[PDB]
Motif scaffolding. Sequence first.
Motif, PDB file in Angstrom:
ATOM      1  N   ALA B  77      21.059  11.742  47.833  1.00 34.25           N
ATOM      2  CA  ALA B  77      20.792  12.823  46.889  1.00 34.25           C
ATOM      3  C   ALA B  77      19.761  13.800  47.442  1.00 34.25           C
ATOM      4  CB  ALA B  77      20.328  12.247  45.552  1.00 34.25           C
ATOM      5  N   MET B  78      18.635  13.279  47.933  1.00 35.04           N
ATOM      6  CA  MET B  78      17.586  14.169  48.421  1.00 35.04           C
ATOM      7  C   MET B  78      18.071  14.988  49.612  1.00 35.04           C
ATOM      8  SD  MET B  78      14.761  14.989  47.159  1.00 35.04           S
ATOM      9  CE  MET B  78      14.258  15.724  48.706  1.00 35.04           C
ATOM     10  N   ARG B  83      19.961  20.186  52.128  1.00 36.57           N
ATOM     11  CA  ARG B  83      21.078  20.961  52.659  1.00 36.57           C
ATOM     12  C   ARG B  83      21.392  22.151  51.762  1.00 36.57           C
ATOM     13  NH1 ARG B  83      24.184  18.397  57.246  1.00 36.57           N
ATOM     14  NH2 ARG B  83      26.210  18.919  56.317  1.00 36.57           N
ATOM     15  N   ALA B  84      21.428  21.929  50.450  1.00 39.67           N
ATOM     16  CA  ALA B  84      21.640  23.032  49.521  1.00 39.67           C
ATOM     17  C   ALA B  84      20.532  24.068  49.637  1.00 39.67           C
ATOM     18  CB  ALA B  84      21.722  22.500  48.094  1.00 39.67           C
ATOM     19  N   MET B  85      19.288  23.610  49.778  1.00 42.09           N
ATOM     20  CA  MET B  85      18.160  24.524  49.909  1.00 42.09           C
ATOM     21  C   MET B  85      18.346  25.451  51.101  1.00 42.09           C
ATOM     22  SD  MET B  85      15.313  25.352  48.435  1.00 42.09           S
ATOM     23  CE  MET B  85      14.259  26.707  48.933  1.00 42.09           C
ATOM     24  N   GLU B  86      18.678  24.887  52.260  1.00 42.95           N
ATOM     25  CA  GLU B  86      18.841  25.728  53.439  1.00 42.95           C
ATOM     26  C   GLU B  86      20.148  26.507  53.427  1.00 42.95           C
ATOM     27  OE1 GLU B  86      21.352  25.079  55.655  1.00 42.95           O
ATOM     28  OE2 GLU B  86      21.958  23.121  54.882  1.00 42.95           O
ATOM     29  N   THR B  87      21.095  26.143  52.561  1.00 46.90           N
ATOM     30  CA  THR B  87      22.376  26.841  52.539  1.00 46.90           C
ATOM     31  C   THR B  87      22.251  28.222  51.908  1.00 46.90           C
ATOM     32  OG1 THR B  87      23.557  24.734  52.434  1.00 46.90           O
ATOM     33  CG2 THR B  87      24.760  26.715  51.776  1.00 46.90           C
ATOM     34  N   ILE B 123       8.353  12.336  49.647  1.00 48.54           N
ATOM     35  CA  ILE B 123       9.227  12.668  48.528  1.00 48.54           C
ATOM     36  C   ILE B 123       8.419  13.248  47.376  1.00 48.54           C
ATOM     37  CG2 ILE B 123      10.439  11.526  46.636  1.00 48.54           C
ATOM     38  CD1 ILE B 123      11.967   9.937  48.807  1.00 48.54           C
ATOM     39  N   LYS B 124       7.244  12.674  47.106  1.00 47.96           N
ATOM     40  CA  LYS B 124       6.388  13.202  46.051  1.00 47.96           C
ATOM     41  C   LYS B 124       5.994  14.645  46.335  1.00 47.96           C
ATOM     42  CE  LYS B 124       4.821  10.848  43.407  1.00 47.96           C
ATOM     43  NZ  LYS B 124       5.088  10.379  42.021  1.00 47.96           N
ATOM     44  N   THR B 125       5.584  14.934  47.571  1.00 45.23           N
ATOM     45  CA  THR B 125       5.181  16.296  47.908  1.00 45.23           C
ATOM     46  C   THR B 125       6.363  17.258  47.869  1.00 45.23           C
ATOM     47  OG1 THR B 125       5.354  15.658  50.236  1.00 45.23           O
ATOM     48  CG2 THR B 125       3.165  15.631  49.235  1.00 45.23           C
ATOM     49  N   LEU B 126       7.536  16.817  48.329  1.00 45.98           N
ATOM     50  CA  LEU B 126       8.702  17.697  48.341  1.00 45.98           C
ATOM     51  C   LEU B 126       9.168  18.031  46.931  1.00 45.98           C
ATOM     52  CD1 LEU B 126      10.792  16.439  51.362  1.00 45.98           C
ATOM     53  CD2 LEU B 126      10.234  18.816  50.853  1.00 45.98           C
ATOM     54  N   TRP B 127       9.127  17.054  46.022  1.00 45.46           N
ATOM     55  CA  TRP B 127       9.606  17.298  44.666  1.00 45.46           C
ATOM     56  C   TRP B 127       8.782  18.361  43.952  1.00 45.46           C
ATOM     57  CZ3 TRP B 127      13.713  17.026  41.978  1.00 45.46           C
ATOM     58  CH2 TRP B 127      13.673  17.066  40.581  1.00 45.46           C
ATOM     59  N   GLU B 141      26.729  25.568  42.492  1.00 43.53           N
ATOM     60  CA  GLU B 141      27.527  25.816  43.689  1.00 43.53           C
ATOM     61  C   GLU B 141      27.698  24.568  44.555  1.00 43.53           C
ATOM     62  OE1 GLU B 141      29.588  28.016  44.839  1.00 43.53           O
ATOM     63  OE2 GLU B 141      29.781  26.501  46.415  1.00 43.53           O
ATOM     64  N   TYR B 142      26.607  23.865  44.853  1.00 42.06           N
ATOM     65  CA  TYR B 142      26.592  22.895  45.944  1.00 42.06           C
ATOM     66  C   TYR B 142      26.961  21.471  45.536  1.00 42.06           C
ATOM     67  CZ  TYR B 142      21.863  22.330  44.076  1.00 42.06           C
ATOM     68  OH  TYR B 142      20.777  22.154  43.252  1.00 42.06           O
ATOM     69  N   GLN B 143      27.400  21.260  44.299  1.00 40.05           N
ATOM     70  CA  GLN B 143      27.899  19.973  43.792  1.00 40.05           C
ATOM     71  C   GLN B 143      27.049  18.783  44.244  1.00 40.05           C
ATOM     72  OE1 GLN B 143      29.974  17.862  46.189  1.00 40.05           O
ATOM     73  NE2 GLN B 143      29.444  19.334  47.797  1.00 40.05           N
ATOM     74  N   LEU B 144      25.795  18.795  43.806  1.00 38.56           N
ATOM     75  CA  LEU B 144      24.919  17.650  43.979  1.00 38.56           C
ATOM     76  C   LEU B 144      25.319  16.546  43.001  1.00 38.56           C
ATOM     77  CD1 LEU B 144      21.077  18.041  44.410  1.00 38.56           C
ATOM     78  CD2 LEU B 144      21.922  16.390  42.826  1.00 38.56           C
TER      79      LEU B 144
END
Lengths: 53, 350, 296, 336, 67, 232
Positions: B77-78, B83-87, B123-127, B141-144
């Motif tokens: 999931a993460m 990938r969606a972020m950079e897309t 993960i805590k910092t990224l969230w 769009e990115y079907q997570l």
Amino acid sequence: IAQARKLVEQLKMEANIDRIKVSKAAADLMAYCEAHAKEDPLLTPVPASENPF
Amino acid sequence: TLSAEDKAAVERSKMIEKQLRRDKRDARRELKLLLLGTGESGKSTFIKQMRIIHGAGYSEEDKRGFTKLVYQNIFTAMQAMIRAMETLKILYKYEQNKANALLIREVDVEKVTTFEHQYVSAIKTLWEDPGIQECYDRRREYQLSDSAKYYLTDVDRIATLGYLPTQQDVLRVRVPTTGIIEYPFDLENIIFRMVDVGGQRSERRKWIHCFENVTSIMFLVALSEYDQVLVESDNENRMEESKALFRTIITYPWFQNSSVILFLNKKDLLEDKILYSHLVDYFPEFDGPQRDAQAAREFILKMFVDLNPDSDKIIYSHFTCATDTENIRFVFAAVKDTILQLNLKEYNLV
Amino acid sequence: DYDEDATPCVFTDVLNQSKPVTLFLYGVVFLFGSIGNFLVIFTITWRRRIQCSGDVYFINLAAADLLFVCTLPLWMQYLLDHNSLASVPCTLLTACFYVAMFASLCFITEIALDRYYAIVYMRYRPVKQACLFSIFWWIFAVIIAIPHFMVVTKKDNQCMTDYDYLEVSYPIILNVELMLGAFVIPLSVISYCYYRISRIVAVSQSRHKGRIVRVLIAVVLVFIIFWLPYHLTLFVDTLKLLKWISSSCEFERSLKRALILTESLAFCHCCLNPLLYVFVGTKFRQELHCLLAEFR
Amino acid sequence: DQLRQEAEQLKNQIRDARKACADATLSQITNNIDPVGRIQMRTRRTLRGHLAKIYAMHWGTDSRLLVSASQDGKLIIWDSYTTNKVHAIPLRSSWVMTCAYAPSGNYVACGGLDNICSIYNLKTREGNVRVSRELAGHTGYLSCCRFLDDNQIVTSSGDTTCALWDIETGQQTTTFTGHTGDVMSLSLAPDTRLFVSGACDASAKLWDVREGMCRQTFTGHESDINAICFFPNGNAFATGSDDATCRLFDLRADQELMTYSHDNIICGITSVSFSKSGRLLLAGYDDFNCNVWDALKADRAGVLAGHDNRVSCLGVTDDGMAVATGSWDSFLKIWN
Amino acid sequence: QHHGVTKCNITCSKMTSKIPVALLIHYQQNQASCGKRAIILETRQHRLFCADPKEQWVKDAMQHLDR
Amino acid sequence: VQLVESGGGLVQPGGSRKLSCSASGFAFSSFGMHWVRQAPEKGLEWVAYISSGSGTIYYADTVKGRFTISRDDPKNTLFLQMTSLRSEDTAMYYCVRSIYYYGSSPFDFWGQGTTLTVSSSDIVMTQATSSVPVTPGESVSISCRSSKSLLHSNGNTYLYWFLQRPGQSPQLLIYRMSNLASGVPDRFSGSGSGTAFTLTISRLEAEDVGVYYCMQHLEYPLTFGAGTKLEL
Ligand SMILES: Nc1nc2c(ncn2[C@@H]2O[C@H](COP(=O)(O)OP(=O)(O)O)[C@@H](O)[C@H]2O)c(=O)[nH]1
Ligand SMILES: *[C@@H]1O[C@H](CO)[C@@H](O)[C@H](O)[C@H]1NC(C)=O
């Protein structure tokens, strides 16, 4: 990327094979079928004494 | 004209036929219910609930056995999130966050089995980034994966050392099984058995005829999927895909005898999603009021019922929520009745 | 001379005219029953083994019917000529005849009763208990035919039970028991069971229910038509024997004519059973094709 | 991109070369041959012990025993001469799709939809069959199995790959990849050195069991194929395709020689098998009747009939002396 | 036994009391198949009357026919 | 793979006696058992036999009406009841095993056996020799004639060949005149004409000395032969 290279490679290796005349192969198969034709029971039947069915 | 030794062989074959006839009678009380539906509809979750309500087979070790899959889920999931972020080419506001992506991107999902403090901190910092939050808000769009909100808010409850997965959590993990899964059970002296055909990726024509004369087809459709589009093809409607599948299913002769029941799922998300999106935009045909759950439900059910080529088959429907436990307890009790009466065995009635 | 109130009558002519038609009917029913029960008693046991209770009941029924049809040429010979009484006493003939009739009727009842229990309650009984129930039904058929067994045999070159028993009601009691036992009970059980099954088969989707309902209505319409007239005529004779209605000779001769003719018609029902029950089934027809193939 | 045009050029080269090789057709050579005439066949035995449709059966090397696999989760062994039953064995994964019999007469291989082909030891102490090796690892759905000895087994599934396994070690040895559709049938040569496999891309391939590289590719059909079988001598093979047109290919000339076709037939092909002598081709149809075609003339010779549903499997005994047929009716029939 | 085969045809009920012997011409015996306990006598009137054998008069009649 | 019996001791004439044969370690439900007598001064004698599922019972003519055998499959046991034992009934009793289908080999495994002492036509086989002085290092031939053509229409000959080392239980050697039981070295091989069959022990080895036993199985009641004793 890589699958195309593999396919071109396999196709390039796919050439060094002898090709004999079709006539010779057909004559070979006619000889073989003719020669042993007598043995097959489905083509020339058998008396009932030998047949276990 | 026999001997005095082959009589034993005759006795053996007689006794083996006498053995076979008992299994003959034994296998006249079963009703296979073939489940169908497109991906992510929720086919496995029904089987799981079903196991809980009657079999009650879950045990502490069995619950433990899923931890690895839980970690795999959270990481995949993460990774989809990154990938969606950079897309979509969305700028980051924090420089440290940009660095924190390399360490989590190129990670072998299968190998990972446990946590250390590094991944928890990452993960805590990224969230925390509001860019991640807006990307989640734009998950069209990115079907997570749908069941990501649950895990990403409770990462610390997993980060502890003494982790035992709870009953609620296990119902949302997705277990990788390639082979068909078959679950028999018995109620009121009738043995039900159902199969799952969501795990086979080969051509369908070759193995479908192996399912001739199944008693019932249970189709499953997701409600909330209607507004999901894909970048790869300029026009993409998940609804149209499921509609094409459904139209194909009824034209095979193999299932003409079998009855068709179509369940709808994910009604809850639907009632939490319509509040700022208009169905009329997606489908011109609709003309009723807006901000109405009832209108959309009725429209969808009506259109599926109307898409029957034969017009001589009465298809039934129900509205269910997959995660709930009492809803299924009631809907399955309903279907049992409305399927058992409508089934008969010939038994030399010609 | 002076006064003779009593005036007897004779009815030789009606008997003579009646004899040929009943004789021909006996011949034809014997031929068709013999040629139409051997096939069922063969195709369901020799090659195709026994599957469930239904095939055991079918075999036992066919056997009872074959036993019924195997006696008839003896009566055919006895009719035209009354010689060679020494071959067999009449008692055995009457006994086998009546027990065969009652066994056939009781199996017509029992097959329907089991077909009722099986479908609605999903009950499938094992074969061995079916064998025991079959033996019980045969014993019941034997033990219910005892009243007719007391028949004097070949007394004064003719065989019949003497009407000398002190009880003057013995013929009426035999007639009433025969009609009540052999008519109302089978019709009632068959009608009730089939009517009950009809609703369930009329609700569910089977893609060929129509054939099932048509077959059931055909079965009941056939059974009802053939047996009615005989029992109505026997009823009218029972009322006559009670002397309630006035008695006249023309009434007697015409009643005997109608009674003998409808009795001759009644026996035709036995031969028709295999076409009505077994052959409509697709599987048996295909096995019959598979058996017609080999022997020719 | 240039690779694609080079591949097209090589395709043109191979096509022109094979076209150059082909001098004359088989029909022209085979004009002066006396015909077969008319042959009839009779049903000698009817074996009936199943409750469901039959998918596969295979003769034994002994030429007396046969094994049949049905959907009822049970596979049984029949003795052909006197019809009695020796071994009825239940299997766990009730969706079976192929069977196979060991040449030694000790093992029986069955495979199915659960992707696990369980091998069964027959001759053992206590007289009860047990599962020996729970061979696993393949993905998709197995389609067939053929022993090569008491050790090596080839398998083919829906993963577009062929795999060679060793029973004792239990791990894969060699993979024969390169297909793009799905493999349908296998056929071992009499010398047990070469096998050919037909895919769902309308393409046959000859494999070398030793080196592990695909020696020759065979194009030509317009649709998926369903059955393959070698000529008894080992120099050609016949194919059955859904277009109903069976075809013959010889190895040495590397081209198709003769096509069976007729206008009244439109159904698919379930099974194909030569006879021992090599002059007859038994083919199985969806029109409920299998047909016997002469090899060298393309005329018919009769019909076998008797079934209500499609014929799922054929079997020719090693003595060329009997043919077994299995159809979707829980019946098996032996013809002589 | 069962209906359809019955060889006797006389089903008399009333027993005769007394007949003048002169009018009597022919003596028969009732059919013994059904076993009815009657006796048939045909008179000069060409009509048949049924009586009971226990009366002496039938024995006198049989003696008269015998002579 | 183990069969143990019980019920040994002394009995008085005019009584009753139960004998039990246990069975542990196999699918006992599908094995037709036999019983075998062995007098201390003579060869072998067939006693009785039970089929599978009690569907068939046979008896020797000399013992009919005095014995009875019943099999208890749920607990895997077998009982033989004797009444009115005579003075000739003292012997050694063996419990055996046998499965009959196509290609199987009956009489594979023999029990340990129990002794029983007391106080107070049909095809006859023959043996032409008794003592045979052995010659280590060379071949030896044993012969068995008969009284009927043991060949049948199906083309198989129901003659067997046993072995019994001293102080042990006999094991199978050769079944149906050509084959060999799995578990014996390949030195053994039997050849014979329809009247007479011979066995040829090639290259004798130490500890091979034993009393042999020709046995036929054409029609019940199957009998044995006196056999030969190897000595040196
Ligand atoms: N919260 C919530 N989640 C659901 C519901 N129905 C399905 N899901 C999620 O959707 C996912 C569907 O997974 P799965 O059963 O594998 O779908 P499949 O691929 O079609 O088999 C599950 O992981 C669930 O967590 C629902 O009613 N509520
Ligand atoms: C009826 O029965 C009497 C009694 O013997 C007989 O004499 C008479 O001939 C019979 N009538 C016929 C045969 O028409």
